Write a protein that binds this ligand. Structure first.
Ligand SMILES: O=c1ccn([C@H]2C[C@H](O)[C@@H](COP(=O)(O)NP(=O)(O)OP(=O)(O)O)O2)c(=O)[nH]1
Ligand SMILES: [Ca+2]
Ligand SMILES: [Ca+2]
Ligand SMILES: [Ca+2]
Ligand SMILES: [Ca+2]
Ligand SMILES: [Ca+2]
Length: 901
DNA sequence: TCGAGTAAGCAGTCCGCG
DNA sequence: GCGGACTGCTTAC
């Protein structure tokens, strides 16, 4: 078995490494690693080492890591570049694992934990840790066991042992419904006192030391709480046993508004699942409580209990412990679906970094590029300081606000990475500059050809064509990986639609789901068997197909994120290869590419229609164009189509056989114009959209840039069983829009696009009539809440106080004096409701922590005084008015001459 | 919100606009 | 009442 690292740290002049040896055993070692760094040397001196620009370097081998660090400092004192990898543990990993790492996840100890702390006087601050830890559940991936540490005796109450038999039974039996599949995996340990609990936990931790440590808010709460509580009870040395090297650091995390403290445990890789979720999920959620996210991801019900959490252990210890266990399991269930741990491991081992560095694309790419260069005996440049400077981005076309009946969209494959590769954009491939014409002149192909020697971008930059830069070389590798996983994702998606179709005609039989790989398009044999299956089996297959789609989505979209972040890093001052010339080369080329192909598509369609000067491209943003297909449909005549699927087939074939070849020709000419290294502008059909055949639906509409809705029948080769709304930017897509209002606005849009004006009118009339019955949470707005203190002047709104902050200040006055009441936390999200004039809260709105019921003391008053009229006008009527005016229709029936009959 | 980038939309404050 | 200048927040890419 090939060896692989688990964790690596630098502690003074030593590297401390945990690793899996060639026999599959976990080991630890301390290595007196002697790092090398580099200085430029005379061309006369014979070396094998060259910088990225081809300048020769001499290697300097240091007696230890502190000597190397001191040398860097002195080189700055002299004013000379100190070249090489200054993060010595990355150099250590590069030397020690000089091959593509194959890791075995079954040997990696992944721990998932959660603690409970009863607190009568508000939130238990981890820096203080003044309250007993009364429960820990710690799941270990190697053992596949939930270890439960339960405090029976506390100053806040003495309790009886938790019962696994009660835990297992249904809620209807008085049980806790702990999932049957984990019941046999629970190892329950009760304790007579907190000191014994914590000592045993540390002994357990020593035996089963996490490599990856995760859970929900573990970095901000659980870890600092446990560390500080042990520190308070036993002293520092004992608390440091949470580190396998007995080293910890209090780390100050800073933002624009303030700072917070976390505990760095040397030799452990903390991947807090909340942070993995925020980075890798591509959602923006109204709440990030585990109950909220679990309900969203898994469709599990919120865990119900009577009274406040501060009294739960005393009143119902049985439920208290069961809920602690379930909380740990829910994170495991979310990871089973989303697979963010798998992603982090893949990425981390690929780059040869500490696994926790997957949060930083700058660190990830620094390591990838370093390792790549090192293989050629090339030497990385020193990082330099740069002032933050703005630079230009993508082009977005201003659409004419209107309905658009038939629409075909086209999109460039992985645009910015493709530009990097096509143009050959890299720190070491810069060849020089040329005199720039206005962008318009390049778009229309009237400007002089930039170069007959080098590969060009319309920002004035020229690049070598003789060899690929390291940035193109390395970005291509990850792009190719992304392509494979996107293939699996789309196959799974297409497979899901086959099952959805079959579910229209389920067979009356007792069946089992088919044992199949959803990552590959179903064979004819599989399709024939699916048509014979029961609804139970089909639904189970659909669930499995959709789970496979999600797995593929995680793998593909986050590889996309990584490569797009390499582009972004070029425009971040902390990146070793920061260069606004290269960042701007990419974006400016993109602006040209979009507008160039806009022209070419307009030219092609005008030719085939026999018309002159009309605009077929109605919209474009960054790398995509939207083409009006009305005239193409009208050339055949709607009466000649059998059904909706018939004109969809026709447009699909037209896009693939006619437009794509023309688009390809257009881009090949642009490549020659810019003298680029390799043609990689691949623009393929994305969406086919329109109303159902024979209906009064409008098909689609735009209100402005980044704000549109389309009724889509086929998306990237997936032919839907039922049409899918593609809605971008509109209020249905915003986390700030109330839940029930998103739902209502979506139905309004559906009716507009699929059914027409009259259908829209009847739904509006009903919503307006009934909406006051909707649950208050479902009609509350949502907002992040920053700078509460800034706008707080004696408990009242200061100058220019934002609406949501005003609401928080109102809440704060209403709960004043109560240490029990939930506090609004700076930087988190709040629900917001408007209040009718003359209300007892003394202001026009109130806000409270999102994902929660408002506290009982003020709930009745909030409900009594909620301003339904303002709520409706602001969240529903205003956006709907926007949609309908753009689409040129009315949400309320206009008076007619027929009324007088 | 510690963690790659820019474009650009809407809500709301403040206050001009005879 | 609406718009511009501005802050705040959130989305598309
Ligand atoms: O998070 C992002 C998204 C997009 N972009 C830029 C780069 C990207 O190539 C371009 C187009 O984004 P898309 O969302 O269309 N995806 P892309 O073309 O990169 O990939 P895909 O192949 O999926 O379309 O906009 C970013 O820089 N960061
Ligand atoms: Ca694209
Ligand atoms: Ca694409
Ligand atoms: Ca059937
Ligand atoms: Ca796109
Ligand atoms: Ca193609």
């Amino acid at each position: 078995m090939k060896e692989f690292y688990l964790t690596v740290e630098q502690i003074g002049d030593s590297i401390f490494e945990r690793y899996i040896d060639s026999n599959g055993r976990e080991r630890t070692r301390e290595v007196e690693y002697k790092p090398s760094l580099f200085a430029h040397c005379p061309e006369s001196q014979a070396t094998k080492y060259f910088d990225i620009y081809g300048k020769p370097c001499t290697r300097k081998l240091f007696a230890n890591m502190r000597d190397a660090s001191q040398w860097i400092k002195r080189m700055e004192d002299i004013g000379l570049e100190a070249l090489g990898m200054d993060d010595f543990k990355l150099a250590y990993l590069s030397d020690t694992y000089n091959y593509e790492i194959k890791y075995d996840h079954t040997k990696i100890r992944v721990a998932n934990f959660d603690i409970e702390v009863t607190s009568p006087d508000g939130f238990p601050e981890p820096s203080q840790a003044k309250h007993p830890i009364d429960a820990i559940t710690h799941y270990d991936s190697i053992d596949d066991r939930f270890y439960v540490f339960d405090l029976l005796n506390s100053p806040y109450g003495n309790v009886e042992e938790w019962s696994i038999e009660i835990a297992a039974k249904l809620q209807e039996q008085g049980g806790d419904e702990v999932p049957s599949e984990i019941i046999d995996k629970i190892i329950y340990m009760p304790f007579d006192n907190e000191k014994e609990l914590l000592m045993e936990y540390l002994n357990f931790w020593q035996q089963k030391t996490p490599v990856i440590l995760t859970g929900w808010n573990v970095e901000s709460f659980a870890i600092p709480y446990v560390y500080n509580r042990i520190k308070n009870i036993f002293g520092e040395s004992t608390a440091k046993r949470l580190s396998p090297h007995r080293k910890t650091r209090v780390k100050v995390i800073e933002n624009m508004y303030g700072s917070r403290e976390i505990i760095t445990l040397f030799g452990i890789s903390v991947l807090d699942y909340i942070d993995l979720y925020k980075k890798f999920s591509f959602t923006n959620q109204p709440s990030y409580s585990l109950d909220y996210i679990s309900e969203f991801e898994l469709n599990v019900g919120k865990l119900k209990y009577d009274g406040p959490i501060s009294k739960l252990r005393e009143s119902n210890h049985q439920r208290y412990i069961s809920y602690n266990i379930i909380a740990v399991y829910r994170v495991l269930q979310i990871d089973a679906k989303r697979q963010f741990i798998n992603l982090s491991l893949d990425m981390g081992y690929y780059a040869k970094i500490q696994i926790q560095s997957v949060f930083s694309p700058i660190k990830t790419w620094d390591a990838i590029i370093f390792n790549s260069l090192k293989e050629q005996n090339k030497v990385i440049p020193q990082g330099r300081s740069h002032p933050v400077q703005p630079y230009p981005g993508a082009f977005v076309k201003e659409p004419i606000p209107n309905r658009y009946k038939y629409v075909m969209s086209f999109d460039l494959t992985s645009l910015y990475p493709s530009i990097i590769r096509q143009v050959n954009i890299s720190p070491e491939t810069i060849a020089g500059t040329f005199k720039v014409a206005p962008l318009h002149d390049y778009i229309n192909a009237v400007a002089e050809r930039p170069s007959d020697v080098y590969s060009c971008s319309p920002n004035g930059m020229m690049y070598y064509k003789d060899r690929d830069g390291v940035v193109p070389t390395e970005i291509t590798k990850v792009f190719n990986q992304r392509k494979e996983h996107k293939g699996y994702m789309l196959a799974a998606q297409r497979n899901g639609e086959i099952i959805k179709e079959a579910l229209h005609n389920p067979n009356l039989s007792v069946d089992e789901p088919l044992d199949v790989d959803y990552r590959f398009d179903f064979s004819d044999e599989i399709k024939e068997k699916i048509k014979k299956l029961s609804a139970k089996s089909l639904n189970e297959m659909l669930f499995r197909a959709q789970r496979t789609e999600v797995a593929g989505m995680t793998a593909q979209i986050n590889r996309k994120l990584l490569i797009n972040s390499l582009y972004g890093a070029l425009g971040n001052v902390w990146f070793r290869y920061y260069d606004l010339r290269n960042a701007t080369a990419i974006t400016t080329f993109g602006q040209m590419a979009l507008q160039w192909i806009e022209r070419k598509v307009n030219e092609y369609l005008n030719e085939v229609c026999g018309t002159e000067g009309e605009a077929f491209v109605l919209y474009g943003d960054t790398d995509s164009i939207y083409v009006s297909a009305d005239k193409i449909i009208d050339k055949v005549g709607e009466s000649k189509f059998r059904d909706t699927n018939h004109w969809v087939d026709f447009l699909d074939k037209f896009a693939r056989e006619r437009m794509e070849p023309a688009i390809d020709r257009g881009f090949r000419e642009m490549c020659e114009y810019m003298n680029n290294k390799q043609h990689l502008m691949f623009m393929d059909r994305e969406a086919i959209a329109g109303p159902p055949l024979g209906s009064k639906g409008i098909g689609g509409f735009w209100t402005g840039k980044k704000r549109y809705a389309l009724n889509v029948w086929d998306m990237e080769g997936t032919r839907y069983a039922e049409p899918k709304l593609k809605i971008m930017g509109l209020e249905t897509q915003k986390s700030s829009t109330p839940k029930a209002v998103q739902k209502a606005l979506k139905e309004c849009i559906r009716r507009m696009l699929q059914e027409g004006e009259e259908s829209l009118q009847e739904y509006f009339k009903e919503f307006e009539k009934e909406f006051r019955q909707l649950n208050y949470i479902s009609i509350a707005s949502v907002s992040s809440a920053n700078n509460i203190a800034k706008y707080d002047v004696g408990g009242f709104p200061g100058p220019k106080c934002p609406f949501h902050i005003r609401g928080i200040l109102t809440y704060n006055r209403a709960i004043k004096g109560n240490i029990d009441a939930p506090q609004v936390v700076e930087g988190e999200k709040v629900y917001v409701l408007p209040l009718r004039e003359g209300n007892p809260f003394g202001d026009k709105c109130i806000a409270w922590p999102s994902g929660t019921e408002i506290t009982d003391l003020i709930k009745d008053d909030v409900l009594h005084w909620m301003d339904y009229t303002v709520l409706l006008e602001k969240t529903f009527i205003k956006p709907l008015e926007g949609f309908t005016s753009a689409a040129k229709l009315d949400y309320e029936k206009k008076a007619s001459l027929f009324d007088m009959f």
